[PDB]
């Protein structure tokens with residue numbers, strides 16, 4: 520059990536690192552020091568009316584409560600929209616359960632049910648943290664807390680209102696209806712705490728990472744990379760930071776996509792500067808590269824820039840397209856974390872239209888390395904990514 524003990528030690532070191540980052544770049548003080556201030560700056564009358572909301576949430580939900588939630592979101596005659604309903608959950612959600620059933624039209628549908636006391640527990644949890652943001656802003660000198668409230672409010676309701684996630688899925692269901700390579704389940708019914716979609720199943724990407732075949736890894740890895748670039752060009756949207764649980768390989772060779780609670784807006788499609796930057800980076804055209812990256816916002820305006828660092832900055836994007844079929848390995852990813860610079864020209868505040876895809880691409884690239892997949896990324900880039908193909 521000793522490797523999973525490393526996993527817990529790895530998660531704990533990673534989570535405390537982000538706490539330190541939060542202290543230095545956010546609250547401008549330690550978590551211990553801040554907790555002291557918040558204890559006094561926040562009344563005890565607000566301390567526990569919050570407490571009671573969290574106790575309502577034994578681990579799997581009893582069937583009587585599943586009906587109860589269904590009695591609310593779908594109503595009195597919710598069993599008349601189903602042909603049958605399995606009271607035993609097939610999976611677990613973040614704050615709910617997933618039930619397999621049969622719709623009235625004969626289709627197999629997957630039904631997600633949110634726990635009864637999760638709405639109050641999370642909304643209260645929002646107000647408390649929102650209250651703490653006020654404390655830091657008013658009492659902690661030199662604290663950066665912009666948009667932190669906006670972030671938390673958006674995250675919360677995306678978790679509490681299933682209609683928002685379902686709306687995103689309906690968007691991908693139309694653009695990728697009848698598609699040769701991608702299958703997105705249609706949304707049958709949507710409610711604040713109940714969402715119903717078509718049932719699909721295959722080989723989970725997680726199962727492929729563990730002990731999948733070489734061909735399985737390459738295939739679903741190629742499809743994942745294609746989805747990253749095709750979605751913004753076709754749908755004006757980008758599927759957010761991807762977790763292996765969101766994807767599966769269908770028997771016919773297609774990739775299944777089941778989660779859309781992370782969709783980010785890309786109205787004007789994929790930016791032209793990104794593909795153009797990588798193109799100039801590969802051809803070593805530093806003469807046209809640096810002014811381009813400056814205009815785009817990859818590097819800071821009016822600052823001395825090292826070519827040596829530019830190469831480190833883009834090599835995770837350039838090296839894959841320097842061949843026809845790149846082999847995304849973990850060993851390669853380890854080499855990317857090695858700097859020839861020994862103790863900043865980067866832009867630590869990228870514009871939104873560049874920040875969104877680059878984060879997604881980075882997360883996708885990490886998954887491809889866990890897959891040990893062979894991906895024709897060079898071809899995909901020429902076809903889908905604007906500016907990358909030579910004019």
Ligand SMILES: CC[C@H]1OC(=O)[C@H](C)[C@@H](O[C@H]2C[C@@](C)(OC)[C@@H](O)[C@H](C)O2)[C@H](C)[C@@H](O[C@@H]2O[C@H](C)C[C@H](N(C)C)[C@H]2O)[C@](C)(O)C[C@@H](C)C(=O)[C@H](C)[C@@H](O)[C@]1(C)O
Pocket residue numbers: 666669670673674677759760780781782783784871874875876878879
């Ligand atoms: C892709 C990578 C991730 O998105 C980002 O990091 C970009 C950089 C933010 O935009 C940035 C940049 C910008 C300008 O939004 C475009 C800004 O308004 C917000 C606060 O932060 C996003 C998308 C924000 O959304 C936006 O939040 C707004 C409050 C409302 C907006 N909506 C009306 C469209 C909504 O899309 C927000 C809060 O992170 C969404 C929450 C739910 C997430 O955690 C989502 C699911 C992320 O995992 C993500 C989408 O993968």
